[PDB]
Amino acid sequence: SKGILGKKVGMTQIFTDNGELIPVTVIEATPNTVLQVKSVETDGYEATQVGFDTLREVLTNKPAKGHAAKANTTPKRFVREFKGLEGAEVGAEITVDTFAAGDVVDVTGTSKGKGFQGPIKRHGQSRGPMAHGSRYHRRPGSMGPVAANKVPKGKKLAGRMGNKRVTVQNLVIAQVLPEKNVILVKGNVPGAKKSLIVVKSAIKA
Amino acid sequence: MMKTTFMANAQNVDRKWYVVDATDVPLGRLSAVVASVLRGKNKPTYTPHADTGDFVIVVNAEKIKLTGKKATDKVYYSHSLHPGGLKSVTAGELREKNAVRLIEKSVKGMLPHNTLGRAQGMKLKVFVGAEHTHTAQKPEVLDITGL
Amino acid sequence: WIARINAAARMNGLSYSKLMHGLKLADIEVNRKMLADIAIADAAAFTALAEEAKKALA
Amino acid sequence: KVRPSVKPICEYCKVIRRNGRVMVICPNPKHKQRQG
Amino acid sequence: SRIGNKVIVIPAGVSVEVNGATVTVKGPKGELVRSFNENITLEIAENEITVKRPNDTKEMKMLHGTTRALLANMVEGVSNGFSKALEMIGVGYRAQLQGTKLVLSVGKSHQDEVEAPENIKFVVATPTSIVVEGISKEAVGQTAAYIRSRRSPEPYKGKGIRYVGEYVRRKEGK
RNA sequence: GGCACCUCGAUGUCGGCUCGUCGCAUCCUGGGGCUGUAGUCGGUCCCAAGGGUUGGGCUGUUCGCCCAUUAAAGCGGCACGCGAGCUGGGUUCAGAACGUCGUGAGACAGUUCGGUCCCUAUCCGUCGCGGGCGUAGGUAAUUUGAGAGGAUCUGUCCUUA
RNA sequence: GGAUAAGCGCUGAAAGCAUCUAAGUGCGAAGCCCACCUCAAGAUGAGAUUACCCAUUCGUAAGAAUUAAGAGCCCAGAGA
């Protein structure tokens, strides 16, 4: 019910109304390309595995033009899902101007891939003390109590990090100033450079 | 003298199918004898590697004749390996939801805990309110009593 | 031996203890494990010797 | 309120094993003897 | 005992189905239905009821004597249908009628109501004096308990909803 | 405290830093009862371990004290949690000194200055990414969700008045 | 949301009364579970759906070798 098929071009700030300089952002607002409804009977869920991003001939496949089989025309690149649907056509559907889940938008992205990091670097424990003749600094700390001959899991200790999709709740923009090709959003919308920002809304709202 | 024994089964196995049900039957007294048939222990052909694993079918598995307040003080448990891994499915709860592991976990307590025990024990046939499915083969209803 | 013979006895609905009890009640035969070996194809030997035990409890 | 050794306190009291718990029934809000 | 040995007359054609809880009673309220004991040892007689006992231990006889009181509650419950005592004593504790889920006004920043699923048969005589009607004593007493469930009486002055006896033992101070 | 049963061909024994986990005899937040509770603020216990449970000065050292606080400034367990993670202020080298004891050699946890903390991860276990196979064809997309985790806190003011 | 702990209920029964209990019915908590988010069919039970290739050649018994649909090597670069 939210065809938000699109990426950003970056992160900015603009005053909008009564001044009010706001960290501002955008989505490219490409026309939505939604396939058929695919109701609960053949598959117990409800959602749409919506296609997006309009390939040329090279990046396709006979299950991709062969996805223009069981679609009608125009093979695409990306496919997500949206539960909460309206449904118009098997393969490609109606564009940005409709909004049917909420304007505290709970926006979903796929975070910036910063790599393998230090132990603090996103796990956020205290870095060790530097001075006073102690070797110990930049190492996270002990983890195994002595009474078991084990260590536990669960404690975040390291990890190659960044390609982790996040669904942040209630991003705050009002009824969007539209365009043929803009979507105003606010500020630190997650994701990365050239990352699709599709979003369902009002799940805590 | 030496080979007076006989397996007579350890390649030439049998395969038979049994709708086994009573809507309310008590859990232990159903459980150990359906354990006996899923062994094939009642079949006169036992081998420790027999594979007389019966197609033990249950439908309509809503009720145990529940002695005492066992739907209030039966309470199950589990432990995920995350520390402090208590997760408990409890006594009357999930009986009405999914009375499946309400049976076959107890039949895991019945069975010889090995690869054959987990073979037929993980080849049970379990239905809780059904008329089951796939009567393409031939099923046969087994008894009532605890024998 | 005893397990498969109480398997076939239990197929005749007979329990091993009262069967053997009927074997001590029974004839010159207290023969045990060849009587276990009749698990192959012996309704005559198995169920008829079981009937010998039925007229031994009787 | 709580005393495991419940002995009678007011006249015409009542001793119950309510839900397997020996509670105390009186007309006075002062003493309402919880078993424990 | 001295209940189940005694009889309960069923006047005015109560129209009981003897099948199970299917036992239905008839009055000016009409043909209602509550329960049975379990299904068994309930000899529903005619023009009266003589429910038998299967045995006389405190499970056996005593719990159909329970249902001598319960089918008794169907008989005299349907015979008129009634309520309990209910009076909203308070310096501003007023109560009026809003359709059938009606207004009870403590003074909280929420507004209080009354709802009954099948039987109000109702009158606010005044914001002091209220009465409802139900048929089951259980429905009545749980309904008036629902009236208690929004503002209780005090140990200090008259509040809450009156029942004619409480032996208030009203505490003091100053 | 006692006990000498493993540890003398090695069980490194303070306190602290870091990193936590569980228990509840619950410190606050939750509900409820009683009150010698008009309320406001209290006492009191019942159920409750979801979450949270301050920062500094001094004390090497626990305990404890002070300040100012908040929702409160919990108690313990875990090799008085953790030295193949760390420090080394504490006995626990050898010096030197005092006091006191011993003729003396020295000693007396009595004090104090200085005082010698290695390990290039093999397994298991942890964290993150891969290959080989499988899922009765080879594929290529899609998801359900069996299950597993995370997260849960709390003022302040106004209205109701 | 639901199940509730504690607690508070109606009717009731030995015990004609009484009685939140014995059946039978309620209310009721940061507890629990679901619901909020994430990992998720190696969930061997390996799911379910969408499309494509199709059903080849060699005695093929055994297999062997093409090859489709593809997928990949190889190269470029980074949102990684």
mmCIF file of C-alpha atoms in Angstrom, chain D residues 9-32:
data_model
loop_
_atom_site.group_PDB
_atom_site.id
_atom_site.type_symbol
_atom_site.label_atom_id
_atom_site.label_comp_id
_atom_site.label_asym_id
_atom_site.label_seq_id
_atom_site.Cartn_x
_atom_site.Cartn_y
_atom_site.Cartn_z
ATOM 1 C CA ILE D 9 -9.285 -14.794 66.857
ATOM 2 C CA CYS D 10 -12.827 -13.462 66.711
ATOM 3 C CA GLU D 11 -15.841 -15.416 67.809
ATOM 4 C CA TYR D 12 -18.019 -16.956 65.043
ATOM 5 C CA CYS D 13 -14.992 -16.924 62.715
ATOM 6 C CA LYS D 14 -14.555 -19.247 59.770
ATOM 7 C CA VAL D 15 -11.567 -21.339 58.725
ATOM 8 C CA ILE D 16 -11.391 -22.238 55.044
ATOM 9 C CA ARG D 17 -9.028 -24.298 52.946
ATOM 10 C CA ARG D 18 -9.864 -22.123 49.958
ATOM 11 C CA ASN D 19 -7.935 -23.368 46.900
ATOM 12 C CA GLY D 20 -5.902 -25.415 49.324
ATOM 13 C CA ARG D 21 -5.129 -22.279 51.312
ATOM 14 C CA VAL D 22 -6.343 -21.949 54.881
ATOM 15 C CA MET D 23 -7.836 -18.495 54.831
ATOM 16 C CA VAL D 24 -9.795 -16.752 57.531
ATOM 17 C CA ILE D 25 -13.271 -15.230 57.349
ATOM 18 C CA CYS D 26 -14.296 -12.611 59.890
ATOM 19 C CA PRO D 27 -16.508 -9.517 59.889
ATOM 20 C CA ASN D 28 -13.700 -7.157 60.844
ATOM 21 C CA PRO D 29 -11.364 -5.391 58.401
ATOM 22 C CA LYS D 30 -8.782 -5.094 61.166
ATOM 23 C CA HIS D 31 -8.038 -8.804 61.374
ATOM 24 C CA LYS D 32 -8.116 -10.657 58.054
#
